[PDB]
Write a protein that holds these residues in place. Structure first.
Motif, short mmCIF file in Angstrom:
data_model
loop_
_atom_site.label_atom_id
_atom_site.label_comp_id
_atom_site.label_asym_id
_atom_site.label_seq_id
_atom_site.Cartn_x
_atom_site.Cartn_y
_atom_site.Cartn_z
N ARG A 258 -6.99 -0.21 -7.06
CA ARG A 258 -7.70 0.12 -5.83
C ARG A 258 -7.05 1.31 -5.12
NH1 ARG A 258 -6.82 -4.42 -2.86
NH2 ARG A 258 -5.58 -3.30 -1.27
N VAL A 259 -5.76 1.18 -4.82
CA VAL A 259 -5.03 2.19 -4.03
C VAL A 259 -4.98 3.56 -4.72
CG1 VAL A 259 -2.71 2.82 -3.22
CG2 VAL A 259 -3.63 0.53 -2.75
N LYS A 260 -4.84 3.57 -6.04
CA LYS A 260 -4.78 4.82 -6.78
C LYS A 260 -6.16 5.39 -7.12
CE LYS A 260 -0.43 5.77 -7.72
NZ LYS A 260 0.26 6.91 -7.02
N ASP A 261 -7.21 4.62 -6.81
CA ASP A 261 -8.57 4.95 -7.19
C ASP A 261 -8.64 5.40 -8.65
OD1 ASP A 261 -11.37 5.22 -6.03
OD2 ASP A 261 -11.13 7.23 -6.87
N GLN B 267 -4.71 -4.12 -6.86
CA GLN B 267 -4.35 -3.32 -5.70
C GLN B 267 -3.88 -1.92 -6.09
OE1 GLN B 267 -1.64 -5.16 -2.96
NE2 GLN B 267 -1.67 -3.37 -1.58
N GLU C 149 4.40 6.58 -9.54
CA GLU C 149 3.67 7.17 -10.65
C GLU C 149 3.33 6.16 -11.77
OE1 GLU C 149 6.34 10.32 -11.74
OE2 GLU C 149 5.56 11.74 -10.27
N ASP D 283 0.83 -1.20 0.00
CA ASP D 283 0.00 0.00 0.00
C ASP D 283 0.86 1.26 0.00
OD1 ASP D 283 -3.12 0.86 0.73
OD2 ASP D 283 -1.63 2.27 1.51
N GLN D 284 1.94 1.25 0.78
CA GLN D 284 2.80 2.41 0.88
C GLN D 284 3.48 2.79 -0.45
OE1 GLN D 284 3.08 4.72 3.04
NE2 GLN D 284 4.51 5.72 1.63
N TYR D 285 3.98 1.81 -1.19
CA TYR D 285 4.68 2.16 -2.42
C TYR D 285 3.72 2.38 -3.59
CZ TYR D 285 4.68 -2.93 -3.83
OH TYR D 285 4.36 -4.23 -4.16
N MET D 286 2.61 1.66 -3.59
CA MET D 286 1.56 1.87 -4.58
C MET D 286 0.96 3.26 -4.47
SD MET D 286 -0.34 -1.81 -4.75
CE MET D 286 0.57 -3.32 -5.14
N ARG D 287 1.03 3.85 -3.28
CA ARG D 287 0.54 5.21 -3.08
C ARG D 287 1.49 6.24 -3.69
N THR D 288 2.78 6.05 -3.47
CA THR D 288 3.79 7.00 -3.91
C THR D 288 4.09 6.95 -5.41
OG1 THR D 288 4.87 6.86 -1.73
CG2 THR D 288 6.18 7.79 -3.55
#
Ligand SMILES: Nc1nc2c(ncn2[C@@H]2O[C@H](COP(=O)(O)OP(=O)(O)NP(=O)(O)O)[C@@H](O)[C@H]2O)c(=O)[nH]1
Ligand SMILES: [Ca+2]
Ligand SMILES: [Ca+2]
Ligand SMILES: [Mg+2]
Length: 166
Positions: free
Chosen positions: A102-105, A99, A76, A69-74
């Motif tokens: 999901r995480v990037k919506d 994921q 690009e 989740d942490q790296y998928m958020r950061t």
């Protein structure tokens, strides 16, 4: 200059570290040292533009799946890697893509699907099957070999280029 945050993801042993290190340091890693989470940075010129690649090399071992989740958020753009000699790794791709999605919506996250180890003859994932998966996501499929360097620059620079179409 523009900086691109690329993240390499996929099942363990598919060759994420070898791909990254081949790109960045121009040699092949023969041994298998499982990755927790490493970072690389390189100034490169892509299509006339000087830019900075920030590449995160992630864990394929599922025990470290909490860190996703942490790296998928950061990140690009995501290099989604399976090995063409490992059917399970190709099946695992969905869990990564979902994921990220999901995480990037977003249904429109810059990605490239990568079939690695295309130097090996024990193929159990035919190119057409990967092409079908990539088509459903609306992303490119590119085969690579971290060993021979085939497709390595294409795959990473295409990802930089997908980040630029978005
Ligand atoms: N023949 C061949 N072997 C490869 C290729 N890419 C990686 N390998 C081999 O496969 C093994 C796993 O490589 P590695 O890059 O560490 O995999 P990984 O996906 O980074 N693993 P982890 O998820 O645990 O960090 C290594 O022995 C490596 O040399 C490739 O294109 N061709
Ligand atoms: Ca070597
Ligand atoms: Ca088959
Ligand atoms: Mg690795």
């Amino acid at each position: 200059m523009t900086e691109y945050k690329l993240v390499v993801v996929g099942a363990g042993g598919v060759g994420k570290s070898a791909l990254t290190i081949q790109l960045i340091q121009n040699h092949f890693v023969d041994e298998y040292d499982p990755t927790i989470e490493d970072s690389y940075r390189k100034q490169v010129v892509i299509d006339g533009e000087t830019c900075l690649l920030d590449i995160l090399d992630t864990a394929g071992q599922e025990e470290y799946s909490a860190m996703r989740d942490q790296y998928m958020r950061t990140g690009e753009g995501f290099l989604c890697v399976f090995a063409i000699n490992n059917t399970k790794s190709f099946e695992d791709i969905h869990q990564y893509a979902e994921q990220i999605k999901r995480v990037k919506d977003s249904d429109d996250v810059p990605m490239v699907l990568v079939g690695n180890k295309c130097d090996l003859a024990a193929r159990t994932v035919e190119s057409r099957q990967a092409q079908d998966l990539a088509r459903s996501y609306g992303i490119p499929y590119i085969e690579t070999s971290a060993k021979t360097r085939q497709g390595v620059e294409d795959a990473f620079y295409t990802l930089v280029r997908e980040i630029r179409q978005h």
